[PDB]
Amino acid sequence: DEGMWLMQQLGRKYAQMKERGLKMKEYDLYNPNGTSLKDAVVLFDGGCTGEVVSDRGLVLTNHHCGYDMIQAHSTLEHNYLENGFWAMREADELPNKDISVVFIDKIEDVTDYVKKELKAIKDPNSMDYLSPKYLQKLADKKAGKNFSAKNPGLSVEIKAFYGGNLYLMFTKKTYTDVRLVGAPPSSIGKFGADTDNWIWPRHTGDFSIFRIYADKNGNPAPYSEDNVPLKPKRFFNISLGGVQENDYAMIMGFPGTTHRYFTASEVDEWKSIDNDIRIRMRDIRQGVMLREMLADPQIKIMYSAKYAASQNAYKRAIGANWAIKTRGLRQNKQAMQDRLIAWGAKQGTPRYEEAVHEIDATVAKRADLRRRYWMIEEGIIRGIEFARSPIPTEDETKALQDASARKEAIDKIRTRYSKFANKDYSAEVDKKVAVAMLTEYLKEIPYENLPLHLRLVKDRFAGDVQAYVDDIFARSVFGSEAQFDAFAAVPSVEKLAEDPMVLFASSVFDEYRKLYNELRPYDDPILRAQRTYIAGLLEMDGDQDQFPDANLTLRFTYGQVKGYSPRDNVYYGHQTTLDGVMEKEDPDNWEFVVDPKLKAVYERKDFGRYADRSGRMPVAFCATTHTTGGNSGSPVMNANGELIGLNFDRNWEGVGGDIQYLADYQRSIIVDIRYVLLVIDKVGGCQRLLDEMNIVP
Amino acid sequence: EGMWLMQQLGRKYAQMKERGLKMKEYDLYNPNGTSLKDAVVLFDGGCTGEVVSDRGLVLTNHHCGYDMIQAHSTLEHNYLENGFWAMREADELPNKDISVVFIDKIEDVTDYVKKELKAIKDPNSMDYLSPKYLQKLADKKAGKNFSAKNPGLSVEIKAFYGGNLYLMFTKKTYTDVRLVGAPPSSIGKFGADTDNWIWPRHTGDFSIFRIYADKNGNPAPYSEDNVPLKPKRFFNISLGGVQENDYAMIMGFPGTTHRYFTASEVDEWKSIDNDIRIRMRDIRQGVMLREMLADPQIKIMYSAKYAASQNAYKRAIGANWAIKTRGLRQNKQAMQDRLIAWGAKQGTPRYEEAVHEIDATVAKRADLRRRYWMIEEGIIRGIEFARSPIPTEDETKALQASARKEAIDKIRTRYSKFANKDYSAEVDKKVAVAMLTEYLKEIPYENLPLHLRLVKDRFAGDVQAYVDDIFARSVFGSEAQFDAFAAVPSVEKLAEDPMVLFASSVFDEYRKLYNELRPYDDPILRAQRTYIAGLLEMDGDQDQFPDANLTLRFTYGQVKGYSPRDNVYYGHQTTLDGVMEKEDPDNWEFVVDPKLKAVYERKDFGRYADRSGRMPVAFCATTHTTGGNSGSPVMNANGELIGLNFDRNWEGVGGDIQYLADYQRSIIVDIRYVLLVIDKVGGCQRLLDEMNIVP
């Protein structure tokens, strides 16, 4: 609903944005033929957003966005992940291998061009209209003969929007020498850690600092000791005016995916298959894992990351199912499609109703297969560690059946066994997880639909899942180190072919691939019908109050700094303070440890010009902007386009917002720029970064 | 802020009127006439109640009338789960061992008691706080035939302000109090233990009783000839509801507070009482919950024991949060330093000497008190086999006449009560191994109960082996082991039984510590009499209330929410919409009564919903309440009933030592929700009709 707008849509939205508080001129925010604020936004490392905040190429993004780079430069002598990092001179800034920043140099509507090229249709069912290979061939044809050679650092890309009803060509400028400049300690950068993931109120200082480097002329160049900081076209001014409740706020960034044009049948499928299976299976997996972690401190160390990784999409699915149950998402999709069908009936065009019917029929037809796919994926592929145990390759089996190539096969199988049964793998914990996961899987999936090896639970083990799992480990070459070494000393292909763990792993992966291959053909009729469906919605209600689905391209969103009521008699305000960090401090809980320098700043009220009018130190705020994954690190702007914060999360109540925006619950969780500048200043003591920024009173 | 004596109403009236009170002083409390105070009762010795009709109808909490609802519940008519609604007065159920106490008269007898005390001689006598001594004075003042000359009436004298003020209460007690109505437990206890001490709250915590009496309205025990009481005063029910900042007041019987604790007593309360209870109960509850989650039969057997352990555990967590964050220790220290500076200026050193005596006594009893709480939390309440059978002297002097069978039948009865339908020896062994490992780490060998010395001496430090051996060799270790003993009982078998020796040994140490600690209470009590006398002489009997002591008090404040933490606000009122948000059909605590769910769906709120069409459930107020105030009437600026107090938020449990204006709230069930449940859930129109409901 309140959307993720194309840069092209700024003109038609500008008057509403101005009426909601926007004060800057339209072309100062986005101008297709000149420098604008859009030129200070970057796609940071392929999946995050960033922003240029100085005339020397300084870039701000989230701490969780720059996390891998902070970790790659961290050692026992200089643990930057734990203590932070503050380069005191430009020469001290650390280079990063495999990093990139993408500027969106130009954006152009190429719809008529693509649609004319598509008219050369050798099959009306062709999926070339959505093919990256096909669209790249059109982008190259339009850009010219050797565009990348004649314009180094530039590249061209065409993307489909609105289900193939609109196409845009992006001219991108990519820089690959992006150095680490500064980062707060993890105690600030990820204060809530996993406990506060998707949570508002939030007290996390989620930021990190980088710098784009380039050749002498400001052109992209790979890492070189001769590289000089980039003088950019445009950079954000930092505001110290802060935020007030109801203030206008806007974001530019790269939201990844949404499903705003789902039919009511796709919402039901998302709930009853995708979300219910993921919720049920992960709750079983996590329940066994947590009991083992709480009983053995060594198991807690080995399984903490696996547990946290499983919980992230589990929490998302819980938040999504809450919106489906309470916010009428299914009903609003049904009303949307009924309105189009009634309009099509009045216009004498039945193709829109036929398109919704095709989507419904495809959803209803793939139901059993999709249920079986999610059941095996959540239950076994993700749920059971020994599902990803070593499977001897075709060439490994061939090698073991008269040359020195036998020792090569054993060394390769050993390397994979050592990665599977690593320092964090417990066979006992895995057997307990598998017994609970398989009991549920065997209750849901009938004998005729089971992976071939799982048929042995009924046929050979008289229904005893525990005995079947015990037997896999007791007899398998991968059941223990001593069992592998005995095999490695005298390896036979016939031992591997009958190995209970190899057979289980092969069998479950075979069933997983068979289901994937059977389900793949159902995607195309839905995609083709969505092109007709979205064309109708656009022709009926216009390319105005319905935004194109997110597709990792540059979008803008606007709203207000506003809290919300999560439940009866509870209100969460629009702004958190440093006081809230101190309330959450728990010295013996690694997630809620408070940095001693920050604790002292709070005690002494050493807030400088960064505190609010009441002398309180702001930390984070929330806004009615419409964001999703991909928007991490996005610049948050004032009514004047000045930087007031960085987007870093969204509350769980708004995760259903990828299908239907939730005005009374959905909020972008943003780190206040005053808190960012406080941490750089009083925690990092990196005055040179403050000095190179243009800070407005 | 306080829990004021009825006598202090005159002194507080102007401030109450400035805060919004509209009723005349003597209409609320009149020392020589009828007033609203006459409609308040002490319900069943530990709760408050209120008369709401000219036919003796009484409202109190559901958790206050819980035992009576349960005593009348059968498999055929389960009133606890289904609710109860007597459709005629003759259908109201009598209750054995129930009482309602009216506070007929209250008088200051300070000079009388202080003159009588002057005859003591021993300056360290504790008669000034002795219920037996004070009752002898109460009887002497009332007369040598008071209860016979004034039927239903009794007198009682209590100490206040540490023995600096005394009041005599004339009480009228009724023992025929019948069950009239109760909502189902899904309404009466909606939050169940999850929402205990929690605001926001969505629980309709009420039950309905009726006082019966003889033909003249005089107290009489249960009789089929008893007629409902026509009281001299009852509350009018308001349907005007509440708004944020509205004046609210409560009358009730708060039990205990510790408003005059020294800073050393706050430290002791934190570092001994609360930390030990928190640490020990967390170990006990952790083992119990693991076992309950792994075996559904263990969950059935241990649910009540788990819930009972959690209640004071949650209280201690809330209390320690206030000590850590609200500066309770610091404010007591400032209070005592101010008195000491004032006593230095006046030339009277006795106040500083009194605070010093309290500090020295606290410091001296520290190790013993730590040992007492450690054994009490760790073993006496932590381990079930600590309360296993110990053969009496009469029982041993029977097994060494044919009364050997009677001794075995008595020991068997106690064994059967210990190892009952809810007792698991396996769960108990696991709880004991974890509890004893912690206890053995905290209590040194020389301070251990004698049998626990065997962990180091006989079992090479293996707690698991020591516990396994207790059950493997004890006659109370299993039914088969008891039966083998019962067939061939010898006193030598009992005298060497590892479970009997453990149980005896831990109870001996528990009694020895109790007896060693008891003498330390008296110097603190005597010094508190001097300490509070100084505080009263210095800052007056005006902004410092006497500690609660289960006597009638009033408190006033406003209907107001609060901010529990940064960027979070809890408003002053919950709604029926909040009950529906919490509904979880497969969680017994959050099941919603189908009749109530239908009322919400159809918006069948009648005259009970607010101006916006939303149905209120509960509200909170800045009144100062504690345990004993459950069921208390909550009044308007006009003295009309707007709700019943039923709980207080955990953030305010430290309020028994220092009132917390920004966090402490009384959790009250809205009277409009009470009437909506009587009407649309119970269908008991006769109860609505007998109440005086004001628009």
Ligand SMILES: O=C(COc1ccc(F)cc1)N1CCCC1
């Ligand atoms: O308003 C529109 C198109 O709107 C957009 C065109 C390009 C773009 F990048 C974004 C929007 N139309 C109304 C009549 C049919 C076309």
Ligand SMILES: O=C(COc1ccc(F)cc1)N1CCCC1
């Ligand atoms: O309170 C919850 C879930 O709470 C969280 C969900 C996800 C998350 F990341 C954090 C909390 N619910 C009550 C209604 C059904 C869901």
Ligand SMILES: O=C(COc1ccc(F)cc1)N1CCCC1
């Ligand atoms: O949130 C809590 C405790 O919460 C409850 C305590 C008791 C209770 F009955 C219910 C909740 N705390 C945060 C700061 C340390 C204590």
Ligand SMILES: [Cl-]
């Ligand atoms: Cl058509």
Ligand SMILES: [Cl-]
């Ligand atoms: Cl909404």
Ligand SMILES: [Cl-]
């Ligand atoms: Cl009366």
